[PDB]
Amino acid sequence: ALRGTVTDFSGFDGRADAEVLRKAMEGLGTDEDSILNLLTARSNAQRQQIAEEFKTLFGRDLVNDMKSELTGKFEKLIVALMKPSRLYDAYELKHALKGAGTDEKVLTEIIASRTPEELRAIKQAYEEEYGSNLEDDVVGDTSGYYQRMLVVLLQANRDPDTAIDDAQVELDAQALFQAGELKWGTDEEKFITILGTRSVSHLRRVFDKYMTISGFQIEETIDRETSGNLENLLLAVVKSIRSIPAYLAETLYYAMKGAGTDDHTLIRVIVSRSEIDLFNIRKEFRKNFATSLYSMIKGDTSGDYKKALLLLCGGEDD
Ligand SMILES: [Ca+2]
Ligand SMILES: [Ca+2]
Ligand SMILES: [Ca+2]
Ligand SMILES: [Ca+2]
Ligand SMILES: [Ca+2]
Numbered sequence: 001a002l003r004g005t006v007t008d009f010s011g012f013d014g015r016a017d018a019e020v021l022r023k024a025m026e027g028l029g030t031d032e033d034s035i036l037n038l039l040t041a042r043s044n045a046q047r048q049q050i051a052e053e054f055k056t057l058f059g060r061d062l063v064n065d066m067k068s069e070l071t072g073k074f075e076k077l078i079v080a081l082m083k084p085s086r087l088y089d090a091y092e093l094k095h096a097l098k099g100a101g102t103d104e105k106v107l108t109e110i111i112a113s114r115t116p117e118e119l120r121a122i123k124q125a126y127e128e129e130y131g132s133n134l135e136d137d138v139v140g141d142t143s144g145y146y147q148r149m150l151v152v153l154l155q156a157n158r159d160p161d162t163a164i165d166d167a168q169v170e171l172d173a174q175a176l177f178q179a180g181e182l183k184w185g186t187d188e189e190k191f192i193t194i195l196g197t198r199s200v201s202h203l204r205r206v207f208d209k210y211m212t213i214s215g216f217q218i219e220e221t222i223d224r225e226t227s228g229n230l231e232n233l234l235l236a237v238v239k240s241i242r243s244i245p246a247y248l249a250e251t252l253y254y255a256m257k258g259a260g261t262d263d264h265t266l267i268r269v270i271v272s273r274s275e276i277d278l279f280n281i282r283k284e285f286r287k288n289f290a291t292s293l294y295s296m297i298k299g300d301t302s303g304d305y306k307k308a309l310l311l312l313c314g315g316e317d318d
Pocket of ligand 2: 100
């Protein structure tokens with residue numbers, strides 16, 4: 001099934017680890033290698049225990065100390081790595097909504113790729129942490145059908161995968177055909193209801209039937225019928241239905257596409273999926289882009305930041 005690249009470290013000694021981190025920061029200077037070599041070789045749960053022992057032994061906050069010692073991208077990677085797994089997605093969403101503006105590629109990327117079970121956990125954590133309702137903050141920072149689609153997904157009430165009903169597959173495929181290609185204009189409400197609430201296994205069948213009856217892949221029709229945030233979200237949902245690892249592998253690829261690199265996106269994906277499906281993401285990356293994720297990162301990043309990412313990612317050969 002799904003496989004991550006980071007797992008619990010055998011022979012874990014939180015207190016021992018904490019002292020190593022302390023010695024790497026005490027006195028003038030910072031031993032970045034020691035810190036990165038250790039934190040990327042411990043699971044997220046173990047990092048939290050190290051943070052606890054650190055505070056018990058020295059009465060100091062590990063994260064705050066590292067924010068003082070580290071700088072730049074490397075610092076941001078480490079801070080993201082120390083973020084509790086249960087709160088990371090909520091943290092990112094909160095920071096995509098806060099301030100004047102809103103990073104919609106972040107809202108779209110997370111809300112479309114996370115399962116209903118993950119979204120329920122995210123909604124809870126967000127509320128506890130920031131004292132506000134996630135849905136309400138999303139509604140407040142977005143509008144139109146893009147907003148409605150996001151709200152539909154945030155309900156996390158997608159139908160469960162059951163036995164496939166061929167007639168319902170034909171019905172849904174024809175409904176999409178009629179709502180888009182055969183309509184002057186577009187019936188967005190129809191696309192949202194179907195793509196947002198039908199079961200994954202069901203939609204995979206619908207996608208093939210749609211192709212069969214219309215000659216177009218659902219992705220092409222979406223591009224031909226919609227635009228803006230809505231188009232990006234619909235494409236993300238369709239891609240996620242087909243394969244979450246594939247979608248995220250594509251999200252990463254375009255992050256390091258050409259000039260410069262989208263570091264924020266590079267960090268978020270690697271960190272958030274490290275203990276879930278980053279291994280799968282690697283395989284999908286290699287199979288669709290003729291290169292390994294490792295190499296891509298290897299030539300798109302520099303310094304400690306680079307060394308840290310590579311250890312997390314792994315797979316020098318893929
Ligand atoms: Ca120091
Ligand atoms: Ca805003
Ligand atoms: Ca149309
Ligand atoms: Ca378009
Ligand atoms: Ca680049």
